[model samples]
Target: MKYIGAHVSAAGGLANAAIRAAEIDATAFALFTKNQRQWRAAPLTTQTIDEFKAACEKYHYTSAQILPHDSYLINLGHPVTEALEKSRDAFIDEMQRCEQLGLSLLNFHPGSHLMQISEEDCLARIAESINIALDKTQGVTAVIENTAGQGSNLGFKFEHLAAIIDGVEDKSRVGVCIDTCHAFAAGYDLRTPAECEKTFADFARTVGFKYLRGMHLNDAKSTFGSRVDRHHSLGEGNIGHDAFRWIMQDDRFDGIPLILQTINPDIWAEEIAWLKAQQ
Candidate 1:
């Protein structure tokens, strides 16, 4: 099974997102549990939770097939005491929201030091935050997503993620999400079959496949090593469609949520179908 989908909008309510995903013939999907831009919004009522769960069941989607994204305002690596605490609090809230909806995975950018602290100290802090969040919540694993290394983002290399997971108290509660566009933009070549194998082989060596939870499949609009996160539709960018075909057919990535965070929203249905047909 391909488990392919896109980041669909939860404009009215989170439950409506499943309907939209189902409309597109999606077998897997991602969405924010709340207004991602705002710091605080109304929490999910019991009614809304029921509806969301019902929607997932109606669409034949399991918890593994739906990865909820965290708010962008969260930065667990913030050196400032107030800011770091705020981010931690919001992160716990995010996990709780997932728990209420019966979802098990939450996807988020790992963290950025923002130049205020050493990378080592920031990575430790990120792990500490994960420990605290896991202690406070249950059933939800905090998934660390790879970055383009834009600015001070801390998760560019697999070592950074491995280090964070190494520091955490509960390793079982932590995992990873590799964004293909970010990987390419941050210098992991995937344009050729040999390059793709080398990139994932390095990943297997550093981070191991056990920690690989999910993926954001997007073609890069920027050149290799650009360190800029610009996305394009499948087959329309520097990372041609062949790379995706290889990934979808790879046994290493099978049975995981291989999501498309690509551009061109109107054609996401076509993209999803194309990826399914690739196998």
Candidate 2:
């Protein structure tokens, strides 16, 4: 019941992403439905969607196991009028792509305030963006990801995630994803067993495990609590391999997409094999 995979490329076509995942023996995976850098892209044609679904069926992957990431350009917390509205429109477009592909979960970073607005106002904007997107789409959960607190980025603290979820109108359509490297760089140490326990205890206290939609399993190249964002391969960085073993065996994380966004794609199969052995 342990679902672990990586962020595979969607080159050539969307269906190729699923095929690539199957090639790596991934039971779950992450991908961008469109070109993530640009603000807009062509619609997902019937052929594209059908091919993607057919690929899913062919690989024995389900909607629950595939977490499509939104465009990096869409920041829900932008304080400016033009940027904020554009972000909103682009986000709705992102959800539409997910719906067209029959995807159930979408992952994105909680936007930054750019140090222009208060964190409270920025969070309110993020919530409002989600509300509008949910009204514009259906059957897709807005899964917010934690960050390494790099620059003005939000979602480093558990309270920020809880507050965003609290502001959302449809609680069922909102969720959280914890990145192990980000958590470590954001000051929630996970290098030791006791550190891991204390971190999860705090998370459960603030944002219950019910909202945990997925995880990004990457080792940190930055120093612990440094607030820098640099991804390293497993066991080759600050967070050692033991924490992954703990997560792979933990009962609470069972049945969720424990995705590997590590620095190297060549080792993904090896990493997945290691995690499976732990399970």
Candidate 3:
């Protein structure tokens, strides 16, 4: 069966995200362990950890079912030395939080060039940053999400993902998450079932399914090959519903967290139910 869900809010506390997922009848979910917009957050207390674990147990969400995201402010590939170290520090903290919560996966962007350095340099630095973070923490996989290639951000191409993975020291603890809207906007078509098959086959060929840890299920507000990262609700945008149906029927996508990062949270429960019905 496909483990599908949305990126639920953890407004009150980390435990609330699990409750939100359960309320939506989600089999898998994603969340930010801390305030994703902020550069720093208080360390996860023992009480917070216990409560989160209890919530997960009560909701029957295993470590694999929870994919925690890092701060939006973090840029592990920053060209500036001081800023890069700061980003690395924050990323390691995120990994540690995932460890405390017993979550094995922490989803994040590969990092942006910001037009400061060569794409190659930024990619290498991102991998080195991951290496540093991995050495500092344990039991949490750094799951890199593909971007829409907006401005100078990377990870839009399958080769970029492959290059980042190649530079990592420990392959076991690193993985990838493909965002549907981002992939479509980055020029990989997914409007039709055949297109979905071709795109994923390309991903498997270039990046390999061994590193595919999760996915962000979303429709695109922007047109195909636009390179704009705008997400819409399922079937309501250019991507339509057929690609989602293809994923629902594909055995390769099974056993991984298929998270919805769509624009509307109000219809997430409906979307989750609708996706399951596609099977």
Cα TM-score per model: 0.98, 0.99, 0.98
Candidate 1 lDDT tens digits, 128-220: 999999999999988999999998898989899999999988888899999999999999999998999999999999999999889999998
Q: Show the colliding residue pairs in model 3.
A: none
Where in model 3 is the C-alpha error above 4 Å?
none
Worst 10 residues of 2 by lDDT: 35-44
TM-score of 3: 0.98
**Model 3: per-residue Cα lDDT at residue 257:** 94
lDDT per residue, candidate 2, 1-279, as tens digits? 888899999999999999999999999999999997777788789999999999999998898899888887888999896999999999999999999999999999989999899999999999999999999999999999999999989999999999999999999999999999999999998898788888999999999999999999999999899999898999999999888988887888877788999999998999988989988
| Candidate 3 residue-wise lDDT, 1-279, digit = tens | 789899999999999999999999999999989987656789799999998999999999998887888888899899899999889989988998888889999999999988899999999999999999899999999999999999888999999999999999999999999999999999999988889989988998999998999989999999899999999999999999999999998888888899999999999999999999998
For candidate 1, give the lDDT of residue 171: 84
